Write a protein that binds this ligand. Structure first.
Ligand code: MET
Ligand code: NI
Length: 404
């Protein structure tokens, strides 16, 4: 398939140019320049790499707006846990379909998940069309995890590598909900299976433990997506630079739950790899990485207007996120995955046209025209070609009545 006759943004460091993109077998066969014969004329629009959300809890879309004006401890143990106790397998599936509907409308091609009923979340990802690194949330009590690691292993056995779109990793919740012995066991397991780990790290100010413990259990040799890192001591930035450590910056959630602002600019200046995540819809309420990216840029600029430039922001939301997830995406080049997004330039916020890249970060509404993954359209002009919208909406309505 050849889509083009419009502006093309190869990557975060490139300039938009008029051309087209030829896709075959889910990959980019070649990038054409200028006036060329195309199958799909997208004149008046922009084609760029798709985005990658490095932190979420997909089914939480079913809890959007249920836990407001609460501190973290109240949010989790008072409001969220009781409701999650009623969240069924069927609900996990549809909640994930809903999460993908929302994320796809914002140009997201893949996401990293940490939750339960992960097999049904995987089925939803399979059916909808996105890519994903799925992990099971792990917590324990003196080594007893109620079978959570076992469930994560079942998930791995059945879904890791599925269609080159789904990968499986391990999701220890945090260094405080996981005992030291158990966290070590989780890392040993991930290391043995050469699988990634994702965890909430230094999200709250109460977390004052030393990172040496985790640095000696496998953090150096296991690809780890560390969400938040708001209170991560700067003395560790240097050692985290040359290891497969990816920060997942969740600005909205960090503010909403009163945790603060992560020192992203300093982390980047130290050579650390940083990506963007949304967290769940109950503590952000939106699953929009454009919003997340923009907010991130603004928060760092509070200290210095030169912080987080446009190219760096675009790099984090596309290439860096794909890198964290282990996918050859984030750039429109030959041999790379056909994960692309189309943005309408015929909008007030996209003028002057000579500043398109800047608008993507500081003005763009966030609503894309279309999203493609593996060469397939998962969102196009307000519609979801891979699912039965009416059916899904009816099921979601029944779920709201059933859950609440
Ligand atoms: C993000 S899932 C965290 C663990 C979950 N609360 C459980 O009890 O399994
Ligand atoms: Ni989270």
């Amino acid at each position: 398939m050849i889509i083009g006759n419009c502006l093309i943004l190869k990557d975060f460091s490139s300039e938009p140019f008029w051309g087209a993109v030829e896709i075959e077998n889910g990959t980019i066969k070649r990038v054409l320049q200028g006036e060329v014969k195309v199958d799909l004329d997208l004149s008046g629009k922009l084609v760029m790499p798709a985005l990658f959300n490095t932190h979420t809890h997909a089914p939480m879309t079913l809890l959007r707006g249920v836990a407001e004006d609460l501190s973290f401890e109240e949010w989790l143990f008072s409001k969220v846990l009781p409701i999650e106790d009623r969240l069924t397998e069927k609900m996990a599936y549809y909640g994930t379909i809903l999460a993908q509907m929302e994320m796809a409308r914002h140009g997201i091609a893949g996401f990293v998940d940490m939750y339960f009923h992960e097999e049904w979340i995987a089925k939803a990802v399979r059916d909808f069309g996105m890519r994903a690194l799925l992990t099971r949330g792990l917590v324990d009590s003196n080594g007893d995890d109620g079978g959570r690691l076992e469930e994560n292993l079942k998930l791995y056995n059945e879904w890791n590598g599925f269609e080159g779109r789904i990968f499986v990793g391990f999701g220890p919740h945090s260094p405080y909900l996981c005992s030291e012995e158990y966290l070590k066991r989780v890392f040993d397991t991930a290391k043995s299976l050469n699988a990634p780990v994702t965890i909430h790290l230094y999200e709250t100010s109460k977390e004052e433990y030393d990172l040496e413990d985790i640095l000696n259990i496998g953090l150096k040799e296991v690809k780890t997506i560390a969400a938040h890192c708001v209170h991560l001591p700067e003395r560790y930035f240097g050692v985290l630079k040359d290891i497969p450590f990816f920060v997942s910056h969740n600005p909205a959630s960090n503010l909403k739950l009163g945790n603060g602002i992560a020192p992203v600019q300093r982390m980047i200046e130290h050579g650390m790899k940083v990506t963007l995540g949304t967290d769940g819809a109950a503590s952000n309420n939106s699953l929009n990485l454009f919003f997340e990216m923009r907010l991130a840029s603004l928060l760092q600029k509070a200290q210095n207007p030169r912080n987080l430039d446009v190219n760096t922001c675009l790099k984090m939301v596309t290439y860096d996120g794909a890198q964290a997830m282990g996918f050859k995406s984030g750039k429109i080049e030959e041999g790379w995955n056909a994960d692309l997004v189309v943005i309408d330039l015929d909008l007030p916020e996209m003028f002057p046209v000579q500043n398109i890249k800047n608008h993507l970060v500081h003005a763009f509404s966030g609503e894309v025209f279309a999203t493609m993954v593996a060469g397939k359209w998962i969102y196009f002009d307000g519609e979801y070609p891979t699912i039965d919208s009416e059916e899904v909406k009816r099921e979601l309505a029944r779920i709201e009545k059933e859950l609440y």
